[PDB]
Design a protein around this ligand. Structure first.
Ligand SMILES: [Ca+2]
Length: 316
């Protein structure tokens, strides 16, 4: 039963991407482009962590493939798992109506385990929208349910992966989101903050006497390096996340996010080598999204896996 395997992502860097569980409209992109619809088995093998978007819903959130039978979806997850590639279910996204109630910890654990058994998922990504981070009892019920799920699979010899994809400004000192990170200390495998869609947010870098915003293309390398350094050291107004458990999240192209797209690939290569030189090597890259990475612009130009082609060599 290949889908039953939970691939290990230890001892290597990852190239993680999100896969959309809904059909493309005519112009969903931030520049009116269109994303590609595809099977999981159409995803380039270089994407070794695929996060399925999204588990959502009032009461106990859930997930069902929008266009594949459960059997066929599990078969495809099994193909990826046979290749050593992990497939996570991502809880959240826009308009998810996630409002967990105290007392629903075991019901949420049971539904996560059901999704693993039905679809072959290897873990869960937390991608809550801003309205959900402090909603209802999400703060306590979600970490409690996940610890139970992790413990359940660890008893079977399996590592159920837990990841989080916070907007980067969620991670400043005294941030309400830090409660999730602290509650899951020793349970989460990595945190992949979104270095996009917050164009006006920035950091003051004394080393350059410069204010660098997330929408500054001229200084993109320094934005990637210094926001990462701040996050993995707990400086410049940010709380600390261990570098070995840290992943930089980027838009695959300008249709995938309003701002944040890295125009010059060398900015990423250099940010990584600079972190490596300071013994701050990180876990890899995440992108929104795989469907966008093979989509097309408004003018019909194919993105043709630009993100995967630019950065897979860095990861492997
Ligand atoms: Ca699996």
């Amino acid at each position: 039963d290949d889908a039953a395997i939970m691939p290990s992502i230890a001892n290597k860097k990852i190239l993680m991407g999100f896969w959309h569980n809904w059909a493309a409209g005519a112009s969903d992109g931030y520049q009116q482009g269109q994303f590609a619809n595809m099977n999981l088995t159409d995803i380039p093998t270089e994407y070794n962590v695929v996060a399925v978007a999204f588990m959502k819903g009032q009461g106990i959130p859930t997930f069902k493939p929008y266009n594949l039978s459960d059997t066929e979806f599990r078969r495809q997850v099994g193909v990826l798992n046979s290749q050593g590639r992990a497939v996570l279910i991502s809880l959240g996204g826009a308009d998810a109506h996630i409002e967990l109630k105290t007392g629903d910890e075991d019901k949420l654990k049971d539904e996560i385990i059901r999704l693993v058994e039905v679809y072959g998922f290897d873990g869960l990504d937390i991608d809550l929208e801003q309205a959900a981070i402090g909603a209802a009892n999400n703060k306590t019920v979600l970490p409690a349910a996940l610890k139970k799920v992790k413990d359940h699979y660890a008893a079977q010899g399996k590592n159920f992966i837990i990841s989080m994809a916070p907007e980067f400004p969620y991670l400043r000192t005294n941030g309400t989101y830090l409660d999730y990170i602290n509650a899951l200390e020793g349970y989460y495998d990595f945190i992949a903050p979104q270095y996009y869609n917050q164009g006006g947010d920035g950091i003051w870098v004394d080393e350059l006497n410069a204010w660098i915003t997330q929408n500054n293309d001229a200084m993109k390398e320094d934005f990637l390096y210094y926001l990462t350094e701040s996050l993995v050291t707990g400086t410049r107004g940010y709380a600390k996340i261990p570098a070995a458990k840290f992943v930089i999240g980027l838009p695959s192209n300008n249709d995938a996010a309003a701002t944040g797209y890295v125009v010059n690939k060398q900015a990423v290569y250099n940010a990584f080598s600079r972190l490596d030189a300071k013994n701050l090597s990180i876990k890899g890259l995440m992108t929104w999204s795989i469907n966008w990475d093979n989509g097309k612009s408004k003018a019909g130009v194919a993105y043709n896996w630009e993100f995967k082609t630019r950065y897979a060599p860095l990861i492997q």
